[PDB]
Design an enzyme around this catalytic site. Sequence first.
Site, short mmCIF file in Angstrom:
data_model
loop_
_atom_site.label_atom_id
_atom_site.label_comp_id
_atom_site.label_asym_id
_atom_site.label_seq_id
_atom_site.Cartn_x
_atom_site.Cartn_y
_atom_site.Cartn_z
N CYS A 65 4.49 0.96 8.97
CA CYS A 65 4.20 -0.36 7.97
C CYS A 65 5.78 -0.56 7.28
O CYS A 65 6.26 0.31 6.95
CB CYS A 65 3.05 0.04 6.81
SG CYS A 65 1.80 0.30 7.66
N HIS A 89 0.87 -0.97 -0.02
CA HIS A 89 -0.11 -0.06 -0.11
C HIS A 89 0.86 1.35 -0.06
O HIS A 89 0.25 2.30 0.13
CB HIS A 89 -0.97 0.01 1.18
CG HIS A 89 -0.29 -0.05 2.70
ND1 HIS A 89 -0.42 -0.95 3.33
CD2 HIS A 89 -0.06 1.32 3.15
CE1 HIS A 89 -0.06 -0.35 4.58
NE2 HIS A 89 0.32 1.00 4.55
N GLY A 137 2.96 5.33 9.57
CA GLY A 137 4.46 5.41 9.25
C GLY A 137 5.23 4.16 9.52
O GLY A 137 6.27 3.92 9.00
C1 LIG Z 1 1.05 2.11 8.08
N1 LIG Z 1 1.99 2.71 8.27
C2 LIG Z 1 -0.34 2.17 8.82
C3 LIG Z 1 0.07 1.70 10.42
C4 LIG Z 1 -1.10 1.75 11.14
C5 LIG Z 1 -1.66 3.27 11.27
C6 LIG Z 1 -1.76 3.45 12.94
N2 LIG Z 1 -0.94 2.27 13.58
C7 LIG Z 1 -0.65 1.54 12.56
O1 LIG Z 1 -0.15 0.33 13.03
N3 LIG Z 1 -1.49 1.49 8.24
C8 LIG Z 1 -2.73 1.83 7.84
O2 LIG Z 1 -2.78 2.88 8.14
C9 LIG Z 1 -3.43 0.80 7.22
C10 LIG Z 1 -3.43 0.96 5.63
C11 LIG Z 1 -4.87 1.67 5.52
C12 LIG Z 1 -5.83 1.49 6.43
N4 LIG Z 1 -4.79 1.13 7.72
C13 LIG Z 1 -5.01 0.87 8.99
O3 LIG Z 1 -4.19 0.26 9.77
C14 LIG Z 1 -6.52 1.27 9.56
N5 LIG Z 1 -6.96 -0.18 10.05
C15 LIG Z 1 -8.01 -0.72 9.43
O4 LIG Z 1 -8.50 -0.39 8.34
C16 LIG Z 1 -8.52 -2.25 10.02
F1 LIG Z 1 -8.98 -1.88 11.18
F2 LIG Z 1 -9.01 -2.56 9.08
F3 LIG Z 1 -7.40 -2.99 10.25
C17 LIG Z 1 -6.38 2.05 10.46
C18 LIG Z 1 -7.98 2.39 10.92
C19 LIG Z 1 -5.97 3.45 9.99
C20 LIG Z 1 -5.73 2.05 11.85
C21 LIG Z 1 -4.38 0.15 4.94
C22 LIG Z 1 -4.29 0.07 3.40
C23 LIG Z 1 -5.23 -0.86 5.42
#
Ligand SMILES: *C(=N)[C@H](C[C@@H]1CCNC1=O)NC(=O)[C@@H]1[C@@H]2[C@H](CN1C(=O)[C@@H](NC(=O)C(F)(F)F)C(C)(C)C)C2(C)C
Lengths: 305, 305
Positions: free
Chosen positions: A145, A41, A143
Site C-alpha cells: 500500500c 490506514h 506491505g
Molecule cells: C496494504 N499493504 C494491503 C495490500 C493488500 C494485501 C494483499 N495484497 C494487497 O494488495 N492492504 C490491505 O491489507 C487492506 C487494508 C485492510 C484490509 N485490506 C485488504 O486489502 C483486504 N481486502 C479487503 O478487505 C477487500 F476485499 F475489501 F478489498 C484483504 C482481504 C486483506 C486483501 C484495509 C484497511 C482495507
Amino acid sequence: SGFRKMAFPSGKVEGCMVQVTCGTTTLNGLWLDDVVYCPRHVICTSEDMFNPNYEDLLIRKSNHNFLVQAGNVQLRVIGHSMQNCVLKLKVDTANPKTPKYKFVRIQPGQTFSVLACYNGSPSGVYQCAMRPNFTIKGSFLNGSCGSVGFNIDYDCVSFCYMHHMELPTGVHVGTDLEGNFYGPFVDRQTAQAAGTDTTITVNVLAWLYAAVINGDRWFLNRFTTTLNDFNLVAMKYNYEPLTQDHVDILGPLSAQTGIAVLDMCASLKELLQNGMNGRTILGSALLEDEFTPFDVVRQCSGVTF
Amino acid sequence: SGFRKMAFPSGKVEGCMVQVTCGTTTLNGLWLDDVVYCPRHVICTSEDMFNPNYEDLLIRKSNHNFLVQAGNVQLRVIGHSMQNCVLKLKVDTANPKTPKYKFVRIQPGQTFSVLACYNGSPSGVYQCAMRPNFTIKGSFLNGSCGSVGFNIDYDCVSFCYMHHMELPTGVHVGTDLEGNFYGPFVDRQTAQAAGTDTTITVNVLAWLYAAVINGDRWFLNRFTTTLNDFNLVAMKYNYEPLTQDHVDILGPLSAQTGIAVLDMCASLKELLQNGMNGRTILGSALLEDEFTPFDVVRQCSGVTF
Ligand SMILES: *C(=N)[C@H](C[C@@H]1CCNC1=O)NC(=O)[C@@H]1[C@@H]2[C@H](CN1C(=O)[C@@H](NC(=O)C(F)(F)F)C(C)(C)C)C2(C)C
Ligand SMILES: *C(=N)[C@H](C[C@@H]1CCNC1=O)NC(=O)[C@@H]1[C@@H]2[C@H](CN1C(=O)[C@@H](NC(=O)C(F)(F)F)C(C)(C)C)C2(C)C
C-alpha cells in the site's frame, strides 16, 4: 520492430519513495517537495481495519508518532492532515529529487505504470490499465500500500494511482492522489466486490494497429462496417461500445497505416464472431486490451522522456 | 496476489544513460565512473555498415570526434579504445550517479530488464529472456542501439546486454558489456538468421508454480513421472530438456507449495499432450516461459532493491 508491454522508466518516481511507520504498521509514502502522501490506514492496527474510524485514530496521533525514513535518513514530521483516504505529512526537508509533477484522475481504459514498493523500497515496475470496473490487474502483497501509478509526459510525472486494497478475486483497488477511490470501494476490511468487467474496445483496436505496423496482418479482411453495426456485435462479446471520441483518438494510427477505423472494426468483428483458429497476433492467442492508442504510437515511434 | 511480467526499477540505469554522436550517427552510451561504453557502429556511416572495417574507421577518429552529452552537459572525451564490438570512451568526469555494478554474461533462459533509449533518453522498460537461440524478443527502433539489459541484486546492477541489431524476423541481438555477441552474429548489415528457438522448460514450470501460488490450480493432475519420461515428451513439443540443475533451482518453489518437481512435470506433460481446452493459466492461453524460478520467488515474496 517488436511490440512489448512497456512501462515508463521509473527513476523519477523511485527518487520519491519513502517508508512511513506508525506504531507497528509500515507502508510506503510519496515524498514531493516537503510533503509525504501515504494511505491513511498506516494509522490502523490489525484490529482497527474492519471498521476503522480514521478521524478518531488520527486525533490520537502527534507529528512524532509518524516515522518517515528516506534511505538511511529520518525525516522530521512537522504537520499532518487527512484528505479523503490519504494522509499528508509535512516534513521539514524538501525532497531534492522531486520531479516536475501533477496529480491526475484517470478514466477507465487508460493505462499507467506501477512502481511496486515494500518498506519504501522499489520491487519492480509494470504496466496496468484502469479497468472499466475501476479495478487494476496488479501484483501486490501485504506491505505494498502506498505504491503509486503514474504516466510521464516529457519531464512531467502525472501521478494517477495510490494502492490501497486487494479484492477477493486477485484484483486491486486504490485512490487518486487526493485520496478519492476509483470505483465504489471503501478502505475497510469488509465484503466488497467489483462489478463485472468489460473489454476495452478502443485499446484492442489500437493493438491491432500495432500488429499491422509490425507485419502481423493476417486478420485484415476485405470489409467495412458501420459504427452502429459494430457496436451491436461488440455488445454481445462484452466489449465496451466504441464512441466517436474513440474513433477520433484512433485517427493517428489509422492515418499512419492507411486502414480506416471502421475497416479495422470490421476485422475485429470477424475475430469476435469466428475466433482466431489457433493463430496468434503479436504472439498472443487472446486479444489484448491494455495498450491505449497513445501507448502504441509512443512505442512504435520511440518517444522519450 | 496477482502475477505480472515485472521489470526491475530502472532508475539506477537511467542515471547512466548518455548520447554519443560521431559524425552524423547518434546512439546511446552507458556512463559508469569515467568511462562511456557504446556500440562500435557509432563510427559508421550508412554506407559503411554493410562490410565495416571498424579498426580502420576508428584509426581515423580522435577523442574530439566523439560528442558525448549527459543531459545538457557535454562530457569531454580524453581517451578511446575498442573491445570486441564495444567502444570505451574515457571522459574527464566521473558519473556521480554510478551505481554499484558488475558486467555479467548471462545464459540462455535467464531474464533481464531492458531500458530502451533513444538519443540518450529513456523511452520505456520491459522484461526479456535470452532465448535458447541467443535472440531476445524486444521492442527496438532505429536509434535504440546502446540500450542495455540488466538485473539488480539489492544495490548492485549487473549489466548483461547491450543492444546492436534487429534480425529480419522482428527479434533482437546484442553483446555483453565486453562487446562479445550472444550467439553466432556479427555487427554488419548482411544476411543473418537465428537458429530455431525452443521453449524454456524450467521457466514454464516456474510459472506453473506461480499459478498455484495465485490459486490457479486446475491443471494439477494426480500423477508423477520420471525425469527421463518427461524429457521424451518435452522433446517432441520443442521444449528444452529439463536437467537435474533445473530441478534443483525449482527446489524453493517446490518446497513452498508442497508439489514435487516431477509431479509438476507430470501436469505439464498432460498440458502438452492434451492442450488447455480453451482454459487460461494466470490469464494466458499459452504457456509462458519468460519467468525464471528466481523471478517467481522475488515477485511472490516482495523482494526489494
Ligand atoms: C496494504 N499493504 C494491503 C495490500 C493488500 C494485501 C494483499 N495484497 C494487497 O494488495 N492492504 C490491505 O491489507 C487492506 C487494508 C485492510 C484490509 N485490506 C485488504 O486489502 C483486504 N481486502 C479487503 O478487505 C477487500 F476485499 F475489501 F478489498 C484483504 C482481504 C486483506 C486483501 C484495509 C484497511 C482495507
Ligand atoms: C541501431 N540503432 C539499430 C537498431 C535496429 C534498427 C531497427 N531495430 C533495431 O533494433 N541497428 C542497426 O541498424 C544495425 C546496424 C547496421 C545494420 N543493423 C541492423 O539492425 C539490420 N539488421 C541486420 O543487418 C541483421 F539482420 F543482420 F541483423 C537491419 C536490417 C537494419 C535491422 C549494423 C551495423 C548491423
